[PDB]
Design a protein around this ligand. Structure first.
Ligand SMILES: Nc1ncnc2c1ncn2[C@@H]1O[C@H](COP(=O)(O)OP(=O)(O)NP(=O)(O)O)[C@@H](O)[C@H]1O
Length: 263
């Protein structure tokens, strides 16, 4: 990753709190000044936190893709240590959608999902199994591009594929199950999967052949595709590259989205 000089960064406002310290909006001067998010490492970090902190930047720095958060660079030689990324104005996806409930077209929602899916196709090609794909780990920018975020060395049962739970077998097909749950998150404008059901109920339903119900006004193709992501046998779930392609068909022929799922 790129080491950058404290002089080029200027923190402006706190916009959040992370595992290792507060996160700020700011300005990077690489000439020309550009908004950035800035993750700080609290003074008083342990060695373990230092390594986990810089490590995420390391993992992130191995990626270059439109729908993957871009590491601008780290600050590891001076204090506050920082991780500098592209600024995403609309913040986390689940929270954004909750604030803008019913305010997007079905095409804007599906395009958000194709962005995510694309990023997950990139990750899956790089052999990177995210393990924690969820709408809260997607960030969104002024133009509504959704980027997979949160790469890092805690994972809730109900975003997780049954085989990944019972045998702890995490693959890219595990992530595809999670992506179906994100689809339901996006199409319900940020509702919590399985509402207030307990982890126990949730696994009993899933193993009993029962799935999350169709979101209100959900296109039939979007609902069926999520049901394709929630097949008990992972080998039958679509791969991310199938998902991207199906969502592109749907976007290219938007009248496909006029027919809704029922019941
Ligand atoms: N690149 C970014 N651009 C814009 N906002 C960001 C960026 N990264 C993080 N944030 C914001 O800062 C918050 C905390 O960042 P992050 O560490 O990535 O999430 P977290 O540790 O899971 N904590 P939280 O999201 O508050 O539950 C997020 O909710 C975002 O609102």
């Amino acid at each position: 990753t790129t080491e950058i000089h404290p002089s080029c960064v200027t923190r402006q406002k706190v916009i959040g709190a992370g595992e290792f310290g507060e996160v700020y909006k700011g300005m990077l001067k690489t000439k020309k000044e550009v908004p950035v998010a800035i993750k700080t490492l609290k003074a008083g970090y342990t060695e373990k936190q230092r390594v986990d902190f810089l490590g995420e930047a390391g993992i992130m720095g191995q990626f270059s893709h439109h729908n993957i958060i871009r590491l601008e660079g780290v600050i590891s030689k001076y204090k506050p240590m920082m991780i500098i990324t592209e600024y995403m104005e609309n913040g986390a996806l689940d929270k954004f959608l909750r604030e803008k409930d019913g305010e997007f077209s079905v095409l804007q929602l599906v395009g958000m999902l194709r962005g995510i899916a694309a990023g997950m196709k990139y990750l899956a090609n790089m052999n990177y199994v995210h393990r924690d794909l969820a709408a809260r780990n997607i960030l969104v920018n002024s133009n509504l591009v959704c980027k997979v975020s949160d790469f890092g060395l805690k994972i809730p049962i109900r975003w997780t594929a049954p085989e990944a739970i019972s045998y702890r077998k995490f693959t890219s097909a595990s992530d595809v199950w999670s992506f179906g749950i994100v689809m339901w998150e996006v199409m319900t404008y940020g509702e919590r999967p399985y509402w207030e059901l307990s982890n126990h109920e949730v696994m009993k339903a899933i193993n009993d052949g029962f799935r999350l119900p169709t979101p209100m006004d959900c296109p039939s193709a979007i609902y069926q595709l999520m049901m394709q992501c929630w097949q008990q046998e992972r080998a039958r779930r679509p791969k991310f590259a199938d998902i991207v392609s199906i969502l592109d068909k749907l976007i290219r022929a938007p009248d496909s989205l006029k027919t809704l799922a029922d019941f």
